[PDB]
Structure formats: structure tokens, C-alpha cells
Write a protein that binds this DNA or RNA. Structure first.
Ligand SMILES: [Mg+2]
Ligand SMILES: [Mn+2]
Length: 494
DNA sequence: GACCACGGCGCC
DNA sequence: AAGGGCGCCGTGGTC
């Protein structure tokens, strides 16, 4: 490469080095661009950002997020991770991708920008002909990355003083349970230690081991095992409560307050777009897709996610997206009439534990299942309604437990992959319309979305987002969305 | 201090 | 609903 002066011309690939992975917390240590043969290294990274028109490169969405916290509208566009990930969703990291498609992922910004150019070449080449993957790329994954960049930049508001109060309460009850259990044991021990607990239950007290752990073969102390021993001994219910409280305190109540961003007053996740085997997003640092919901204490934690003052949260949930998608994929004239007729699938068919089990093993269903394994064995991958693929190679393993595990992965992906393609497309469609009404998209939770709207315009945003989500891509069966509205996530009623 | 494997468990 | 998909915690441990 011919090392050239900043700035680069239109359309260059960008490479950048961050002091850490979270773009909302990162310092920009270096910035470069590459096009043709030349590398352009920016003398001053942050000022240099202003001269870009869009982010084009490996991890584009991360640079667009950093740009966005700094006040600049720099959207991402082309990203070789996205194409690689469409080709094989086992392509999740730039290290892997680089090694696979012709480069080395290093820590130097110039070499990353170069790397980007050569990789996109090599990958856009592997997508000539793959016309459905090209479509998910142009119409879903590339535009979506702009939307997730803005969601990440915006963040969600948290009531800290509430969480600090919950924390003291919960520390008090933890103390009650732990004293309870130590006396029952006749001695004190580390209750967060599954090994010392295991000695207590099974060696010291007389209780029956029910399961062994996978990798090392210790007697399990999982919830399953403890539920099975609930009647056997009073120490057990206490341990179950202790686990519950300490899980929620260690994972949500204590750390989340400390992640509030000084400049925004909000919490900012990463929505990872190339992290999953099925085309779902993941969320990390912190994960906001696993905020508690089933227990009382869980629901009190969920009250802590709140709208800005004067706004409201708008929570929208697809009603059994996966069964409805199974109806469309399999074409079972019967299962479709069940949804088209507005009726509750769980009633017409105890039974919920067969509607949901048949995802993993009504005849067009079995037919669908069997055709899926066959095309999986033949081609080596299965696919979604939109043609997203997951390669499942052990479908022909000669060990039954591995083949059968593989079959379960193979069944699952077309339905999970499809529900995901749908939610992804629907975010892409919904985003620009929310902006037009000054509303925000805050979170995605697989088949749910959380938006924030000015109180005055909330019922109208909810009406609009519902129709957009319901009509995203009509299928033999209707997609149903439940909408809720409220001042906190629990009241909004997701 | 950073990283690790494991068991365990939060959500979809 | 979680025989599928995730990410995060503390422990016991290395380096
Ligand atoms: Mg829900
Ligand atoms: Mn599972």
C-alpha cells in the first residue's frame, strides 16, 4: 500500500482500534482508511471522524455507535462480517473471518482497514449467485445495523436509587436465609460454592444424589435436583430461595447501577449481529435480553427500567411467533386454520407441552420435520423462510446421541431463524417511522420490542408499531402482536 | 490484575 | 416452553 495523507476519498474501508470492546465506553485510539492501493492514517482519530460520510468495514456498527455518542450522524454500511455471517453463521469473529477469507486480524488500524478491503472483495465474490442471502444482506442485515447502532447509542433509563434500595432489602433477606441454612447444617460454609454445598447435602446430611454434572461428574446441586428433594429436607427450600435472591442481586441489582453512562444517564447494551447460529441477535455488556420477569423479585427489578420523564414505554410482543411460523413453514392446513380463526392453539389441541415439543420431534408437520432432515443431510445446511442458512454437519454422525442432538438443532433453526428474520425486517421497517414521530426504539428481546414515546403521541406510536410488526411479511396465518404501555417495563406489561 | 472451566441460571 | 438459542455470575484455579 502507498501510505497517503488523510482524508480518504469517497467509499474507503475504515479500520479502527478501540481501548475496549464496548463502543459506548471506548476511547478511539486510531483510525485509518483504505481504497485502491492506498492506506490513509488519520493523525487525530476523533477529529478525523468528522470527515467520514459512513462507516464501511469490519465492525462498522461499533464505529457508528462511538460516532453517535459524540454527536455525529455516521451510519454504518458495508461490513464483511455481515456477509460472512450470512454465508455461514459460524463466522462470528473478525479473527475467524480474517483467517478464513484471506487475512490476519491485527491490532493496527491501517492493517484492519486494508483487511477490510480485501475481505469484502473475497466475500462479495462468494455471494455472487446467492440471491436470497444477497437480499437478506441488502434488505435486512445492512440496514438493521444502522438501527441497532442508534438503539445502542440511545440506551435505556434506569431508576438507580430504587435499585440501591432493593439491594439493601435483598441483602437483609439473604442474611436471614443463610443463617437459616447454616444452623440446619450444624455449621457455616460457603453457600455460593456448589462443591461445599454438595458435601453438605449428600455427604453430611443423608440426601440422595439425583444427577451428575457433565464435564467432571460431581453430584449436581441444580434447581432440578433441589426441586426433586424439596420434600426431603427443610434446608432445601432455603437453598432454593438463596439461589434465587443471590442470582438476581449478583447479576442485576448490584452491577446495573454501576453501568450508567456519565454523559447520558442511561444504560447501553451492545446488540451483537453476528453472534448466533440461528440469525437471532444477542445482547451483552450488559445483557438486557435477560432481565428478570417470572419471580416477584424479578418483577421488582423490571420496574427499575423506566421511560424518560414525560415519555412512556411501549412494549410490543409477538404472540407465539414460533408456532405461527411452524404453521406457515409446514403448511399444515389444520394448524393454519387454528390461527386464522383467531383461536388459542393451546386450547384447540398438558397440550402447550406438545405444541412446543413438536418443534423438536397434524401430518404436514412430521412431513415438514422429515423433509427438513432430508434436505439437511443432502445439502449440509437447513434454512429459514428467507433463505438464511445454518450448516448442520453431524446429521450423519454414527453416534445416535450426537446425530439426534444435531437433528434437534436442524429442526429448530428454520423456525427460530424465521421468527428472527421477521423481527429483524420489522425493526428495519419500523425504525424510520418512529423517527418521523420523534419516538425511540430501545430494546429487542427476540420476539418483543420496547420503544419510548412522548406521552402525548404514545397510543399512536403503539398503534403504528403494532400494524408494522403484524404486517411485516404476511403468511398463511396472521401474526398477532400484544401491545402494552407504561411508565416502567413491568407496567408497560411485558 | 486478566483470563480460565465449570456449574448454575437469567431470558426468548 | 425452553431436549433450541443466548450471556453472566461466583468459585476454585492458573499465570
Ligand atoms: Mg413476553
Ligand atoms: Mn436449552
Amino acid at each position: 500500500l502507498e501510505e497517503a495523507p488523510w482524508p480518504p476519498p469517497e467509499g474507503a474501508f475504515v479500520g479502527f482500534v478501540l481501548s475496549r470492546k464496548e463502543p459506548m465506553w471506548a476511547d478511539l485510539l486510531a483510525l485509518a482508511a483504505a481504497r485502491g492501493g492506498r492506506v490513509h492514517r488519520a493523525p487525530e482519530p476523533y477529529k478525523a471522524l468528522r470527515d467520514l460520510k459512513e462507516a464501511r468495514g469490519l465492525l462498522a456498527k461499533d464505529l457508528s455507535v462511538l460516532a453517535l455518542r459524540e454527536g455525529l450522524g455516521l451510519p454504518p454500511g458495508d461490513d464483511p462480517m455481515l456477509l460472512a455471517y450470512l454465508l455461514d453463521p459460524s463466522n462470528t469473529t473478525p479473527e475467524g473471518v480474517a483467517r478464513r477469507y484471506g487475512g490476519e486480524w491485527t491490532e493496527e488500524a491501517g492493517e484492519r482497514a486494508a483487511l477490510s478491503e480485501r475481505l469484502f472483495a473475497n466475500l462479495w465474490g462468494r455471494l455472487e449467485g446467492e440471491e436470497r442471502l444477497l437480499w437478506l444482506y441488502r434488505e435486512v442485515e445492512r440496514p438493521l445495523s444502522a438501527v441497532l447502532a442508534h438503539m445502542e447509542a440511545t440506551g435505556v433509563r434506569l431508576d438507580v436509587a430504587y435499585l440501591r434500595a432493593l439491594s439493601l432489602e435483598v441483602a437483609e433477606e439473604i442474611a436471614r436465609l443463610e443463617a437459616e441454612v447454616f444452623r440446619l447444617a450444624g455449621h457455616p460454609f460457603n453457600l455460593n460454592s456448589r462443591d461445599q454445598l454438595e458435601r453438605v447435602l449428600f455427604d453430611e446430611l443423608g440426601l440422595p444424589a439425583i444427577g451428575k454434572t457433565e464435564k467432571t461428574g460431581k453430584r449436581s446441586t441444580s434447581a432440578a435436583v433441589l426441586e426433586a428433594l424439596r420434600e426431603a429436607h427443610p434446608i432445601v427450600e432455603k437453598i432454593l430461595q438463596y439461589r434465587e435472591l443471590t442470582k438476581l442481586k449478583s447479576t442485576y441489582i448490584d452491577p446495573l447501577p454501576d453501568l450508567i453512562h456519565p454523559r447520558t444517564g442511561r444504560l447501553h447494551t451492545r446488540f451483537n449481529q453476528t453472534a448466533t447460529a440461528t440469525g437471532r441477535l444477542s445482547s451483552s455488556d450488559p445483557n438486557l435480553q435477560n432481565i428478570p420477569v417470572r419471580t416477584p423479585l424479578g418483577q421488582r427489578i423490571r420496574r427499575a427500567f423506566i421511560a424518560e420523564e414525560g415519555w412512556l414505554l411501549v412494549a410490543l410482543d409477538y404472540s407465539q411467533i414460533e408456532l405461527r411460523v411452524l404453521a406457515h413453514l409446514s403448511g399444515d392446513e389444520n394448524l393454519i386454520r387454528v390461527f386464522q380463526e383467531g383461536r388459542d392453539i393451546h386450547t384447540e389441541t398438558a397440550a402447550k407441552t406438545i405444541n412446543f415439543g413438536v418443534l423438536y420431534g397434524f401430518p404436514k408437520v412430521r412431513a415438514w420435520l422429515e423433509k427438513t432432515l432430508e434436505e439437511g443431510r443432502r445439502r449440509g445446511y437447513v434454512e429459514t423462510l428467507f433463505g438464511r442458512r445454518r450448516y448442520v454437519p453431524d446429521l450423519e454422525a454414527r453416534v445416535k446421541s450426537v446425530r439426534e442432538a444435531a437433528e434437534r438443532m436442524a429442526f429448530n433453526m428454520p423456525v427460530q431463524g424465521t421468527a428472527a428474520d421477521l423481527m429483524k425486517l420489522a425493526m428495519v421497517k419500523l425504525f424510520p417511522r418512529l423517527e418521523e414521530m420523534g419516538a425511540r426504539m430501545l430494546l429487542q428481546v427476540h420476539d418483543e420490542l420496547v420503544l419510548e414515546a412522548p406521552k402525548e403521541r404514545a397510543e399512536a406510536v403503539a398503534r403504528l408499531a403494532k400494524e408494522v410488526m403484524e404486517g411485516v411479511y404476511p403468511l398463511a396465518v396472521p401474526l398477532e402482536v400484544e401491545v402494552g404501555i407504561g411508565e416502567d417495563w413491568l407496567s408497560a406489561k411485558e
